[PDB]
Enzyme design. Sequence first.
Site, PDB file in Angstrom:
ATOM      1  CD  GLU A 182      -0.362  -2.120   2.612  1.00  9.43           C
ATOM      2  OE1 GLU A 182       0.173  -2.512   2.190  1.00  9.43           O
ATOM      3  OE2 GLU A 182      -1.306  -2.361   3.559  1.00  9.43           O
TER       4      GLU A 182
ATOM      5  CG  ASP B 213       0.094  -2.915   6.764  1.00  5.92           C
ATOM      6  OD1 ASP B 213       1.384  -3.421   6.376  1.00  5.92           O
ATOM      7  OD2 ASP B 213       0.080  -1.666   6.988  1.00  5.92           O
TER       8      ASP B 213
ATOM      9  CG  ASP C 299      -4.972  -3.871   9.548  1.00  3.47           C
ATOM     10  OD1 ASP C 299      -4.928  -4.281   8.364  1.00  3.47           O
ATOM     11  OD2 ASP C 299      -5.741  -2.868  10.038  1.00  3.47           O
TER      12      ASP C 299
ATOM     13  CD  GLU D 209      -7.037   0.256   7.339  1.00  2.64           C
ATOM     14  OE1 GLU D 209      -7.887   1.166   7.771  1.00  2.64           O
ATOM     15  OE2 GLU D 209      -5.913   0.656   7.612  1.00  2.64           O
TER      16      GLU D 209
ATOM     17  CE1 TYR E   5       0.028  -3.115  10.618  1.00  4.59           C
ATOM     18  CE2 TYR E   5      -1.307  -4.621  11.978  1.00  4.59           C
ATOM     19  CZ  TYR E   5      -1.108  -3.398  10.870  1.00  4.59           C
ATOM     20  OH  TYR E   5      -2.381  -3.132  10.339  1.00  4.59           O
TER      21      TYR E   5
ATOM     22  NE  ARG F 275      -3.719   0.591  12.310  1.00  8.95           N
ATOM     23  CZ  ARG F 275      -4.497   0.822  11.223  1.00  8.95           C
ATOM     24  NH1 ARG F 275      -5.062  -0.032  10.485  1.00  8.95           N
ATOM     25  NH2 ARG F 275      -4.752   2.191  11.070  1.00  8.95           N
TER      26      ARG F 275
ATOM     27  CG  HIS G  99      -1.659 -11.040  15.646  1.00  7.30           C
ATOM     28  ND1 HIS G  99      -2.912 -10.917  15.859  1.00  7.30           N
ATOM     29  CD2 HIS G  99      -1.445 -11.364  14.411  1.00  7.30           C
ATOM     30  CE1 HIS G  99      -3.585 -11.077  14.828  1.00  7.30           C
ATOM     31  NE2 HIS G  99      -2.833 -11.298  13.738  1.00  7.30           N
TER      32      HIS G  99
HETATM   33  C1  LIG Z   1      -8.604  -2.796  10.951  1.00  5.60           C
HETATM   34  C2  LIG Z   1      -8.843  -3.920  12.157  1.00  5.60           C
HETATM   35  C3  LIG Z   1      -7.995  -4.901  12.416  1.00  5.60           C
HETATM   36  N1  LIG Z   1      -8.161  -5.697  13.541  1.00  5.60           N
HETATM   37  C4  LIG Z   1      -7.247  -6.621  13.803  1.00  5.60           C
HETATM   38  C5  LIG Z   1      -5.949  -6.484  14.860  1.00  5.60           C
HETATM   39  C6  LIG Z   1      -5.211  -8.030  14.522  1.00  5.60           C
HETATM   40  O1  LIG Z   1      -3.924  -7.731  13.751  1.00  5.60           O
HETATM   41  C7  LIG Z   1      -6.328  -8.764  13.455  1.00  5.60           C
HETATM   42  C8  LIG Z   1      -6.901  -9.857  14.529  1.00  5.60           C
HETATM   43  O2  LIG Z   1      -7.198 -10.959  13.566  1.00  5.60           O
HETATM   44  P1  LIG Z   1      -8.479 -11.629  13.161  1.00  5.60           P
HETATM   45  O3  LIG Z   1      -9.215 -10.544  12.257  1.00  5.60           O
HETATM   46  O4  LIG Z   1      -8.353 -12.641  12.327  1.00  5.60           O
HETATM   47  O5  LIG Z   1      -9.313 -11.797  14.243  1.00  5.60           O
HETATM   48  O6  LIG Z   1      -6.955  -7.822  12.757  1.00  5.60           O
HETATM   49  C9  LIG Z   1      -9.227  -5.773  14.230  1.00  5.60           C
HETATM   50  O7  LIG Z   1      -9.518  -6.419  15.295  1.00  5.60           O
HETATM   51  N2  LIG Z   1     -10.277  -4.853  13.761  1.00  5.60           N
HETATM   52  C10 LIG Z   1     -10.154  -4.003  12.826  1.00  5.60           C
HETATM   53  O8  LIG Z   1     -11.137  -3.237  12.569  1.00  5.60           O
END
Ligand SMILES: Cc1cn([C@H]2C[C@H](O)[C@@H](COP(=O)(O)O)O2)c(=O)[nH]c1=O
Length: 563
Positions: free
Chosen positions: A8, A88, A90, A92, A296, A298, A339
């Site tokens: 991205e 990335d 996540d 998003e 990462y 987040r 993670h």
């Molecule tokens: C963008 C976004 C990411 N995440 C994330 C943080 C972690 O990197 C990951 C959690 O894994 P999962 O989506 O497979 O349950 O996704 C959320 O939980 N909510 C969101 O809105």
Amino acid sequence: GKALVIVESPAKAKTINKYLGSDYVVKSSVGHIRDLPTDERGALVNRMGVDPWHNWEAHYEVLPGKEKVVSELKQLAEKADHIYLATDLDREGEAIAWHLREVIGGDDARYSRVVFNEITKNAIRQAFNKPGELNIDRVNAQQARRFMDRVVGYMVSPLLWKKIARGLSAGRVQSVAVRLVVEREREIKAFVPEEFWEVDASTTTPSGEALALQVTHQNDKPFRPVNKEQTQAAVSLLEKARYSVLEREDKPTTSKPGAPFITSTLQQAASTRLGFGVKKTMMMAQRLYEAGYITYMRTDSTNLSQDAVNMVRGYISDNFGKKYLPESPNQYENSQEAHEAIRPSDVNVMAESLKDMEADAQKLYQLIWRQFVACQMTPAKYDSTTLTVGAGDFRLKARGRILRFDGWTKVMPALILPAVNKGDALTLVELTPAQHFTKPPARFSEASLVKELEKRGIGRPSTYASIISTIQDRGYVRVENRRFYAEKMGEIVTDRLEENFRELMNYDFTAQMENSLDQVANHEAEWKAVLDHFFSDFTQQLDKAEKDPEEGGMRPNQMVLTS
Ligand SMILES: Cc1cn([C@H]2C[C@H](O)[C@@H](COP(=O)(O)O)O2)c(=O)[nH]c1=O
Ligand SMILES: Cc1cn([C@H]2C[C@H](O)[C@@H](COP(=O)(O)O)O2)c(=O)[nH]c1=O
Ligand SMILES: Cc1cn([C@H]2C[C@H](O)[C@@H](COP(=O)(O)O)O2)c(=O)[nH]c1=O
């Protein structure tokens, strides 16, 4: 013959290029390429770009100026065998990968979704070593969130313009966040400082050593006079009492290092120690990450890979020694919770060695590096002393501590009672009364609000920052001297929403929607059914709100006279 990889950002493209052989061609979409516009009403559906009434059909559109980018990817994607979506990790990130696959089109088999939580040689190899598939559930979880935010924002705000003021905004989570500040603003407004006293005593041991004590009990009851008369009265007794030692409990204590940072904790530490705001911290964290310097940014996981722990333990042995290395690694996994914490990508890279990073960016790395190294070192040891003293019907005490082994604090910047035996007589030299007052609750800080949001399970590592930002330019709350202050309009709108949108403003329900989103990401719930349920409860609330207040509708920013 060749492969095409998409990331991205150019910064991320540069870093990942250093780790991808000649067979690969990296290209950055340079931001989000496609997305949403910038009982039923075609007019409303068009502005939103989502249709709550036709099973959530959506209208995504290529962003301005990014049409050249599409063609750039299109023609590039054909002169390649396979396509790698390395957005990335996540949700998003999963959805951006989705939009990429949609636009470029082509057989689903031409695509792979690689995951990695740091951009390093061995992390990049393994990511493309065992490539994965796009996960539609995580994508649906991401859109679910995006759709309900859009619904709330585009359908509540218009009621607010009509009932309260033009230009106002409503946010699904944002309005809940504002509630916390408003409640905190009120607690403070009604707080009544209370008076209580404390008495200190200066004494002299038999040697002649000075010893300072604090009065704890009187008649075996905790000492806490509430005025000036009570204190003098107590002071007057303490003036004639004979003082004597009656226990020297010398006890060995320890302090343990904290766990490696996760998104929320980094924000608080950066704010409290470096004075960095949430926006600043997350923007620098991102550049360090995309530069390949840290994992990462987040995350809500304090887990550390065996490799990371092995490299740092090695650094501890070489640079600090055996007494700083624990017998076995400190563990703060598998399918779920797989993670990692925010840690440097290579413990051997010092903050002062960061190339393209600014002063504060290096400082954030340092804080992260230190927390990481410290979390894997032994505990610090102290020998704590507690002297309990008796004088007539009173009891006084003095605590003291001596460092015996620095342990984990060794990687942090560089930074005692006299000798007395049970039964020794102390000579009173002076008594000092002191008046204090109970203080009011502390005002939220950007980060400490995120902290409060996390414990209530309201935020999410990937939304905290946006949540803090989005509630500030709207006139609901303000940050003065790095602290939150609720504005009058913030209270006005907050009371309205609590009155006519109770479920939406409830903390438990909001935390529960995050669980519901997780169930979607984990194929335990279907996104549309979850959206239909949300819309059902929402419109019932909304329909009620739009009615005249005499029928229970929302209150207008009224205030009428005698007539
Ligand atoms: C963008 C976004 C990411 N995440 C994330 C943080 C972690 O990197 C990951 C959690 O894994 P999962 O989506 O497979 O349950 O996704 C959320 O939980 N909510 C969101 O809105
Ligand atoms: C008011 C103020 C507090 N702080 C502080 C005091 C605390 O150590 C920390 C945040 O405290 P808190 O977690 O109790 O809210 O940051 C600043 O760094 N700058 C300021 O302007
Ligand atoms: C976690 C932790 C951090 N620190 C930190 C974080 C800041 O970067 C540092 C103060 O900055 P300095 O090292 O540039 O003087 O102190 C401690 O002093 N003790 C601790 O236990």
